[PDB]
Design a binder for this molecule. Structure first.
Ligand SMILES: CCCCCCCCCCCCOP(=O)([O-])OCC[N+](C)(C)C
Ligand SMILES: CCCCCCCCCCCCOP(=O)([O-])OCC[N+](C)(C)C
Ligand SMILES: CCCCCCCCCCCCOP(=O)([O-])OCC[N+](C)(C)C
Ligand SMILES: CCCCCCCCCCCCOP(=O)([O-])OCC[N+](C)(C)C
Ligand SMILES: CCCCCCCCCCCCOP(=O)([O-])OCC[N+](C)(C)C
Ligand SMILES: CCCCCCCCCCCCOP(=O)([O-])OCC[N+](C)(C)C
Ligand SMILES: CCCCCCCCCCCCOP(=O)([O-])OCC[N+](C)(C)C
Ligand SMILES: CCCCCCCCCCCCOP(=O)([O-])OCC[N+](C)(C)C
Ligand SMILES: CCCCCCCCCCCCOP(=O)([O-])OCC[N+](C)(C)C
Length: 10
């Protein structure tokens, strides 16, 4: 999901 994607980018 994009939520985990954003958390990974952070
Ligand atoms: C995490 C949901 C945020 C909802 C508010 C934002 C909506 C507009 C942008 C789209 C955000 C998508 O996000 P995600 O991680 O791929 O959603 C996956 C959701 N399910 C597991 C139910 C399929
Ligand atoms: C900020 C308040 C959030 C409330 C919780 C909302 C949870 C659901 C988020 C859903 C985000 C999009 O996910 P997705 O994988 O593209 O959806 C697959 C299904 N559709 C193609 C019909 C959108
Ligand atoms: C403050 C919160 C902000 C959250 C913002 C999240 C945005 C997530 C956007 C994810 C976009 C992923 O698009 P992609 O796979 O590269 O497709 C690009 C498609 N075209 C080639 C037709 C342009
Ligand atoms: C938060 C954003 C996540 C996006 C992730 C998916 C990227 C790939 C999108 C591929 C579909 C691009 O056509 P659309 O946008 O449906 O065309 C809308 C415009 N018309 C009605 C004129 C056709
Ligand atoms: C602006 C670009 C800066 C580049 C430099 C990065 C420096 C290192 C930052 C390391 C941040 C590590 O992530 P975190 O806070 O533990 O996880 C954020 C997501 N959760 C809270 C859900 C776990
Ligand atoms: C609704 C549309 C409005 C227009 C949005 C225009 C802004 C699009 C920004 C797209 C930026 C793409 O960065 P990327 O290659 O994934 O790098 C991620 C960052 N690091 C390399 C440091 C990890
Ligand atoms: C509430 C949870 C928040 C989690 C936030 C996690 C991300 C932390 C990011 C830490 C940022 C560190 O920036 P800095 O060392 O000055 O590098 C900036 C480098 N550029 C100028 C090239 C972009
Ligand atoms: C750089 C820091 C970015 C922080 C982004 C925070 C986004 C939060 C989105 C939350 C949307 C709602 O989701 P939910 O399933 O009802 O949440 C249940 C969990 N809480 C009770 C803690 C909300
Ligand atoms: C809820 C609001 C959250 C907002 C979070 C904003 C995050 C923005 C991340 C910005 C990441 C920038 O990385 P950077 O090393 O300069 O990129 C690579 C650039 N060079 C190729 C020139 C080295």
């Amino acid at each position: 999901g994009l939520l985990k994607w954003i958390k990974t980018l952070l």
